[PDB]
């Protein structure tokens, strides 16, 4: 198990670690988070008590370095940093565990929720969406726009999600206008899966990452990306059966984890009703349709 120590907590802040969160009071003796499961990407995220503006956070994988958090009073935020000195880092962490200044990642042993939300998410792929190559970890916040959002403005602080646009020449073969607009299988399978993602695991990884950024940061462009990637599958007549089965599982756990109170902003009525009721795959998402009907029947 790994540890993200904090130099200190000078400002009152709600800290999230994956789907968990806890409050730290201004200058409380908090020195970080311990017992973090190895083997998964993680995200540690922040919402200042004094200024809920800018949820922000850091995607990271404990197998890629020793990372810690330090408040920067000039930029006014908790910064992720890497410690290259391995011995210094173990020495710091041990001292803080001995004095019990750390919250324990509270993983219930029956619980696969985080695995199920991050199954296909890889740090190497995250780092190509979030371009900041001098850090092994990736910063996201509430207000970051996507490459597609900038086309419709700083390119260094964007989310470079794969552009999906159903009324684009990429999506529509000349002479197959009707066929391709009404059945996106060409766009899904040839353009996106074979052409861009290489496989469905990379497609699902982006989809899951978009969802998580929408949920944890209220990042609007991520929510658009999550819905576009669902719609592209739902609107394709020809989808490998294993992708549909896995998609149903993926969406199921996303719907399960979403705060009940955030459903109005994070869920797009048109896409979901289309996916569940009108689309080629209306009968293919059994687990997703059943949780959606029982938990958010208002949306439908």
């Amino acid at each position: 198990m790994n540890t993200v120590p904090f130099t200190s907590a000078p400002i009152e802040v709600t800290i999230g670690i994956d789907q968990y969160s806890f409050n730290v009071k201004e200058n409380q003796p908090f020195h970080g988070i311990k017992d973090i499961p190895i083997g998964h990407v993680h995200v540690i995220h922040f919402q200042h008590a004094d200024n809920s503006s800018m949820r922000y956070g850091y995607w990271f994988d404990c197998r890629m370095g020793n990372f810690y958090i330090q408040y920067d009073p000039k930029d006014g935020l908790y910064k992720m940093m890497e410690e290259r000195d391995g011995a210094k880092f173990e020495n710091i962490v041990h001292n803080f565990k001995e004095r019990q200044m750390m919250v324990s990642y509270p993983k219930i042993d029956e619980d696969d929720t985080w695995y199920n939300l991050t199954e296909f998410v890889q740090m190497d792929k995250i780092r190509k969406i979030v371009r900041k190559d001098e850090n092994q970890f990736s910063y996201v916040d509430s207000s970051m726009t996507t490459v597609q959002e900038n086309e419709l403005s700083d390119p260094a602080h964007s989310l470079n999600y794969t552009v999906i646009n159903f009324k684009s020449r990429e999506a529509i073969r000349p002479g197959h206008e009707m066929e391709d607009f009404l059945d996106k299988s060409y766009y899904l399978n040839t353009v996106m899966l074979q052409g861009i993602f290489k496989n469905s695991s990379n497609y699902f990884g982006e989809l899951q990452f978009a969802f998580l950024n929408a949920m944890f940061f209220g990042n609007y462009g991520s929510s658009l990306q999550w819905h576009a990637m669902i719609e592209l599958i739902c609107s394709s007549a020809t989808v490998p059966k294993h992708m549909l089965d896995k998609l149903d599982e993926i969406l199921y756990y996303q719907i399960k984890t979403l705060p009940e109170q955030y459903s109005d902003i994070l869920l797009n009525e048109r896409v979901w009703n289309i996916c569940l009721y009108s689309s080629f795959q209306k009968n293919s998402l059994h687990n997703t349709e059943k949780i959606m009907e029982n938990k958010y029947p208002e949306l439908l």
């Binding site: 009324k167 684009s168 020449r169 529509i172 000349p174 206008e177 009707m178 607009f181």
Partner: protein
């Protein structure tokens, strides 16, 4: 964006534009089968593509063979319209290509936008006007050429005949829409009005009779009276 009565003069500026009406593309008669079921028989149709400034009507005739063996014809018909309009645009020299295409029905927006992705500078727009272009088939010469066609065919008509020699396109379009509104509301009476007087004839190269300015005022007044009349019979006023 959409087109309405606030920006009505834009139709007559010097930006090339076309209206596209697809309401006569897919046409059927509905009849009983020997087994007492119902079946449709398609008949020839046409795309009504009109430059409102010039009066140029590109009438693409839709021969019934285009439907053979096809499913979901009402949906195919919108895509077939969009394909033909796109083919028309590509066939025109660049400086004759429209800067805007206004569809009379909003269901044509996506089919046409998709067919025209190659032309990102051509604006595809709806309109809030209720244009009576469906009545184009009440114009005998246009009806005749559609029903006689044995194959796909594009026919060129000037829907304003020679009117632009004497009036503006604004007034000519207003006359056309009044005539078509009338024909759409009571075709028999509209035609009675237009042809009652045998001394006024339709030139061979025209669609409408050769009315002098004074006679057009009378005709136009009679057509208003007809529309008003039918509005009365309809609503009991």
């Amino acid at each position: 964006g959409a087109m309405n009565s606030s920006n009505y003069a834009e139709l007559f500026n010097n930006d090339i534009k076309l209206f596209v009406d697809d309401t006569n593309v897919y046409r059927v008669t509905v009849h009983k089968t020997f087994e007492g079921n119902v079946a449709t028989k398609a008949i020839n149709g046409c795309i009504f593509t009109l430059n409102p400034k010039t009066g140029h009507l590109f009438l693409k005739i839709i021969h019934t063979s285009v439907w053979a063996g096809q499913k979901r014809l009402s949906q195919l018909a919108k895509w077939k319209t969009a394909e033909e309009v796109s083919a028309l645009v590509r066939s025109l020299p660049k400086e004759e290509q429209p800067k805007q295409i206004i569809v009379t029905r909003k269901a044509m927006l996506d089919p046409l936008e998709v067919h025209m992705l190659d032309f990102p500078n051509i604006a595809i727009r709806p309109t809030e006007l209720r244009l009576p272009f469906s009545a184009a088939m009440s114009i005998d010469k246009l009806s005749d050429v559609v029903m006689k066609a044995t194959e796909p065919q594009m026919v060129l008509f000037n829907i304003y005949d020679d009117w632009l020699d004497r009036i503006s396109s604004y007034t000519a379009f207003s006359r056309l829409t009044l005539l078509l509104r009338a024909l759409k509301t009571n075709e028999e009476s509209a035609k009675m009005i237009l042809l009652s007087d045998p001394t006024i004839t339709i030139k061979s190269y025209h669609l409408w009779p050769s009315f002098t300015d004074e006679q057009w005022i009378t005709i136009e007044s009679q057509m208003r009276d007809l529309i008003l009349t039918e509005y009365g019979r309809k609503y009991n006023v």
